[PDB]
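The protein record passed on for reference:
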Amino acid sequence: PMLYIYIKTQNALVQRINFNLDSQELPQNILWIDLLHPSAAEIAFISSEFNLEFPTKEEREEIELSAKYWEDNATITINAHFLVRDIKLRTEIVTFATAKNILFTIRYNEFSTFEEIQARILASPKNFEDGFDIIDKMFEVRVEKDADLLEWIDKEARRLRTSVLEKKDEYSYDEMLKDISSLQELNMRVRDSLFDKRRAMTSLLKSDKIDKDIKQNLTIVLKDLNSLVEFSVSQLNILDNIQTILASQINIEQ
């Protein structure tokens, strides 16, 4: 159970505070509060200090579990999608919320993509005025890491493409089909992760809690996201076709 508080320093920089709920005193100029493995103490903390509760049934509004974005007059909540090792990956969800101009992240595991987000925010030359500015940069970094994974798939697919089409430097046919199947799965997961971020960013653009400058950045990220979805679809077709070509080769050789 760890609680990290990111503040805007007197330097006009960002500083991270590993905060002890039990004994220590709240800092001022809070930008972002990160809860890792929250216990009831940490959940009580954000509710008591920031009026952040997460009921799935309530009187004031219909809470839809078939959505991943919720906004009321005071707060925004996003159940954000990440990929972690299960190369085999699985879905990992991090809860994002905004309250009193502060960004909240509630997470249940530590993972490499989130560590990159932390490092990026802490090192960025950008001047962060509040938590909404943080979430803006976080979407940018998340799309980059998806791009990196698509690029890694591309390297493997090019190797397989050459090997299969030119019948050059082939290994165990079953192994090559297993690898292709692994790459297909990865490609599918990233695209679906990209679609999640598209829906989240599009909803955020519709919020009057988000200033124009952030919406401008989200629009730029949305353009890049669309490029990556296009790239992922092309890549998927290539893998499916290589599978078929390999399957044909296997069959002819029997």
Remarks:
- The chain has one domain: 2-253.
- Residues 51 and 99 are 8 Å apart (CA to CA).
